[PDB]
Amino acid sequence: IDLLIKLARTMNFTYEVHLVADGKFGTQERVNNSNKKEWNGMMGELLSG
Amino acid sequence: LNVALVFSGPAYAAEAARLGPAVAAAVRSPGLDVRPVALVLNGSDPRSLVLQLCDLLSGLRVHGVVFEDDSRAPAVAPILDFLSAQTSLPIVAVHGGAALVLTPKEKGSTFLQLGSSTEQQLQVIFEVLEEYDWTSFVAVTTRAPGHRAFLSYIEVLTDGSLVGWEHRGALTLDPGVLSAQLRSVSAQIRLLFCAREEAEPVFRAAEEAGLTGSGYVWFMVGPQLAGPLPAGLFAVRSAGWRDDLARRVAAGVAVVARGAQALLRDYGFLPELGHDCRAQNRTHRGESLHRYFMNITWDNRDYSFNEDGFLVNPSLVVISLTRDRTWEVVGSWEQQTLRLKYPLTQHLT
Amino acid sequence: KIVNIGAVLSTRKHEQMFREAVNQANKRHGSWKIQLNATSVTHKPNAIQMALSVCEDLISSQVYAILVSHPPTPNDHFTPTPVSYTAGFYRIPVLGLTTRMSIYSDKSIHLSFLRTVPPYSHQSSVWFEMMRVYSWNHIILLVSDDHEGRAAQKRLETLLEERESKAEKVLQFDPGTKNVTALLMEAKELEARVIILSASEDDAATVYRAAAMLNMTGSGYVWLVGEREISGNALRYAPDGILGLQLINGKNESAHISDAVGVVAQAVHELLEKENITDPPRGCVGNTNIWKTGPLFKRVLMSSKYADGVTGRVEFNEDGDRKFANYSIMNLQNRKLVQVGIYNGTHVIPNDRKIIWPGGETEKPRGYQMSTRLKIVTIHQEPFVYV
Numbered sequence: 001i002d003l004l005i006k007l008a009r010t011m012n013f014t015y016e017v018h019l020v021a022d023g024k025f026g027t028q029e030r031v032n033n034s035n036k037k038e039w040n041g042m043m044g045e046l047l048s049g
Numbered sequence: 050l051n052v053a054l055v056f057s058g059p060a061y062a063a064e065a066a067r068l069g070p071a072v073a074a075a076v077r078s079p080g081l082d083v084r085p086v087a088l089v090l091n092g093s094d095p096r097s098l099v100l101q102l103c104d105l106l107s108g109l110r111v112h113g114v115v116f117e118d119d120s121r122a123p124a125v126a127p128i129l130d131f132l133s134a135q136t137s138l139p140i141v142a143v144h145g146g147a148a149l150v151l152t153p154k155e156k157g158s159t160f161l162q163l164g165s166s167t168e169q170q171l172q173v174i175f176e177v178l179e180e181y182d183w184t185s186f187v188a189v190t191t192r193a194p195g196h197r198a199f200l201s202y203i204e205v206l207t208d209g210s211l212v213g214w215e216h217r218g219a220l221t222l223d224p225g226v227l228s229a230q231l232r233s234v235s236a237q238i239r240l241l242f243c244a245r246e247e248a249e250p251v252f253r254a255a256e257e258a259g260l261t262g263s264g265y266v267w268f269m270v271g272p273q274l275a276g277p278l279p280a281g282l283f284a285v286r287s288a289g290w291r292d293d294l295a296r297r298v299a300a301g302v303a304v305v306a307r308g309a310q311a312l313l314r315d316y317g318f319l320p321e322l323g324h325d326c327r328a329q330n331r332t333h334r335g336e337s338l339h340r341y342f343m344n345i346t347w348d349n350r351d352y353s354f355n356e357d358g359f360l361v362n363p364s365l366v367v368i369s370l371t372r373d374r375t376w377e378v379v380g381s382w383e384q385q386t387l388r389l390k391y392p393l394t395q396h397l398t
Numbered sequence: 399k400i401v402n403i404g405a406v407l408s409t410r411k412h413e414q415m416f417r418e419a420v421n422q423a424n425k426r427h428g429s430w431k432i433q434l435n436a437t438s439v440t441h442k443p444n445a446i447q448m449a450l451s452v453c454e455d456l457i458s459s460q461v462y463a464i465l466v467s468h469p470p471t472p473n474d475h476f477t478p479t480p481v482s483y484t485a486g487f488y489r490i491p492v493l494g495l496t497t498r499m500s501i502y503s504d505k506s507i508h509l510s511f512l513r514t515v516p517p518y519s520h521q522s523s524v525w526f527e528m529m530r531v532y533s534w535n536h537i538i539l540l541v542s543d544d545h546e547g548r549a550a551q552k553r554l555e556t557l558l559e560e561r562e563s564k565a566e567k568v569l570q571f572d573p574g575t576k577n578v579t580a581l582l583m584e585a586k587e588l589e590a591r592v593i594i595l596s597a598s599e600d601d602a603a604t605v606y607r608a609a610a611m612l613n614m615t616g617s618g619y620v621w622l623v624g625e626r627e628i629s630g631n632a633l634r635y636a637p638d639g640i641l642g643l644q645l646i647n648g649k650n651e652s653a654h655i656s657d658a659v660g661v662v663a664q665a666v667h668e669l670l671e672k673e674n675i676t677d678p679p680r681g682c683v684g685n686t687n688i689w690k691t692g693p694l695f696k697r698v699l700m701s702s703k704y705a706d707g708v709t710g711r712v713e714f715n716e717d718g719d720r721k722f723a724n725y726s727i728m729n730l731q732n733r734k735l736v737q738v739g740i741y742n743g744t745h746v747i748p749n750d751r752k753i754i755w756p757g758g759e760t761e762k763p764r765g766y767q768m769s770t771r772l773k774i775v776t777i778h779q780e781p782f783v784y785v
């Protein structure tokens with residue numbers, strides 16, 4: 001977070017943080033659906049929107 | 050209820066009347082009365098098909114029609130689907146020519162099918178493949194009418210497991226020299242997806258290449274019903290030939306009868322809008338039977354037809370082929386197990 | 399000797415020019431064996447004979463092919479359906495005229511089919527070059543959920559993966575639109591300013607009115623609009639800067655009639671083969687046989703040029719693709735629609751008179767907006783991010 005402040009000042013972007021819904025970094029999983037297009041964790045929300 | 054049973058082919062002329070009383074005796078459910086009418090179609094000509102069906106649909110006011118056959122003529126299935134669109138009367142087929150796979154379902158139609166989806170049959174193959182432990186294999190498909198490789202991409206989604214599987218894709222074969230391309234084969238386990246009508250020249254091209262003996266096995270799985278070919282052949286049947294096809298007439302009339310029996314007990318009414326072919330020149334009125342078949346239990350088995358309208362868990366059958374041009378069925382298939390017969394110079398122990 | 403053809407249309411005046419054309423196109427072939435007859439028939443809107451008249455008269459005449467045209471009746475994928483099943487039942491090739499529907503594009507249901515007019519599905523490529531030639535990026539699309547809708551997307555992404563210029567959002571709505579405002583709310587904060595709408599003509603009226611009080615049809619809003627959603631009630635209540643396509647050969651078939659007769663006349667020259675030339679089955683009374691030389695001459699049908707007629711770019715491709723066609727991009731100015739330019743295999747932008755955009759700005763509104771507000775995710779990891 002101490003790094004994030006330095007970036008925000010240099011470039012003028014504001015922000016609001018919020019932690020991850022479920023505490024997992026992110027991988028690909030599929031048991032009853034398409035093998036790809038299944039990103040959970042941080043890799044999910046960044047891709048979703 | 051004025052239920053109708055029809056047949057195509059003069060061979061069913063004698064059994065059309067015989068199955069009449071059998072349907073009444075076999076089907077016995079509370080609150081429902083069965084009134085079958087025996088019919089025989091005059092061949093498979095188009096204009097009689099609409100004339101005979103609609104005139105019976107108008108003169109006799111049939112309430113639901115079930116058709117069955119043993120031929121190899123799937124042409125009339127969409128047409129039967131086509132006329133049923135403007136009447137909202139559900140139609141269910143049993144087996145034979147006009148009962149193969151169909152997709153998609155036409156708008157405003159309830160043409161139920163007693164068939165097996167291509168993906169479901171392919172899934173059964175891999176269960177057989179692991180039992181015999183044939184890890185290295187390649188499938189072969191050709192450019193054939195009414196074919197799409199999209200339904201064959203279920204294999205790419207599968208095969209991700211702790212045992213691992215190998216593939217080489219497939220090589221297309223033109224209808225019209227074929228030995229110059231089919232040589233790109235490495236494993237005896239080969240899966241075929243092509244038209245049955247043009248398969249015979251395809252078999253001849255492969256047979257002259259030495260891919261006929263027990264060293265190289267052949268798979269014949271798909272809408273290629275047959276009940277010069279090599280030895281060691283396997284196919285999927287879904288009890289098409291067995292399971293008393295002379296008795297299924299009582300089975301097919303039963304499931305549709307339960308549809309109105311359940312609808313009446315869920316919504317008491319008599320919505321006979323489709324009493325006449327040309328009662329109203331419009332296609333905006335529907336009696337909404339597509340919302341049914343969520344729970345169909347009979348013969349200690351589930352017959353819940355999906356949106357696609359095929360048996361979700363049918364009694365698929367694996368069959369073999371004796372070298373002496375003899376058809377045979379090996380092993381058996383059930384819900385989720387594969388109880389099968391025969392489970393277990395360069396071949397040394 | 400004599401070859402019969404199917405010429406079902408919806409106008410008794412059109413069938414007159416067939417007789418003189420066949421009595422003219424015969425001399426083009428040289429009349430080695432050309433004694434062809436028109437043999438036209440008129441269809442009826444009623445649904446009883448549409449399953450009967452298909453083989454009541456046509457197959458009794460020993461026809462080799464049939465021509466079907468869209469009647470001026472306000473219907474789609476309705477009239478060319480009966481011929482699709484009947485012709486395929488006998489494996490008879492069937493070609494459509496002004497058949498502008500996307501469901502006539504799969505060979506599974508219609509084994510044999512053709513058309514000399516491209517359908518609405520293929521105009522998606524024309525959108526790509528326009529946004530490419532205008533240096534547009536970060537685009538979104540609003541599509542209904544139906545047969546066209548699935549066919550709407552699937553063509554679009556294939557042309558974008560080479561450059562990986564993926565659309566920002568592909569949000570879609572149901573065809574049964576009724577007071578949809580939440581969906582349009584989502585496509586507001588994403589900083590696109592460019593939207594591609596490809597719904598039906600009725601659906602445009604709802605969204606146009608729904609977007610009216612949302613004030614999202616002002617400046618900084620470029621819209622890409624297909625042909626079907628310009629006319630009708632879509633003409634009313636539309637934004638000013640609507641850009642919409644067209645097709646010059648559309649709504650007419652007289653030039654198509656000459657091309658249709660000529661191309662099948664060319665088939666006769668390559669009917670002279672040592673292979674069997676067996677005639678199609680005769681009579682609808684009863685048949686269990688099909689005539690197998692159909693696909694034999696099919697491969698040559700798309701291997702033809704047939705210069706002139708319609709702009710002289712007649713090629714054909716699988717399932718009536720109709721590779722070459724002029725579109726003639728047009729535009730809305732105030733209320734009177736105008737023209738900006740034409741198009742072919744590669745776009746042409748003559749800029750006939752001018753171009754306008756919502757708000758009347760005389761400058762291309764660059765569709766983009768820098769997002770000076772963005773979120774950050776984080777996980778609880780002890781030495782780096784406490785909680």
Ligand SMILES: *[C@@H]1O[C@H](CO)[C@@H](O)[C@H](O)[C@H]1NC(C)=O
Pocket residue numbers: 010011012
């Ligand atoms: C960021 O914005 C402030 C005021 O809005 C401005 O003074 C500053 O120069 C901007 N940052 C840079 C790097 O110019």
Ligand SMILES: *[C@@H]1O[C@H](CO)[C@@H](O)[C@H](O)[C@H]1NC(C)=O
Pocket residue numbers: 742743744745746
């Ligand atoms: C129209 O066709 C020509 C000839 O192929 C080609 O240059 C382009 O597709 C179009 N013309 C222009 C100037 O873009």
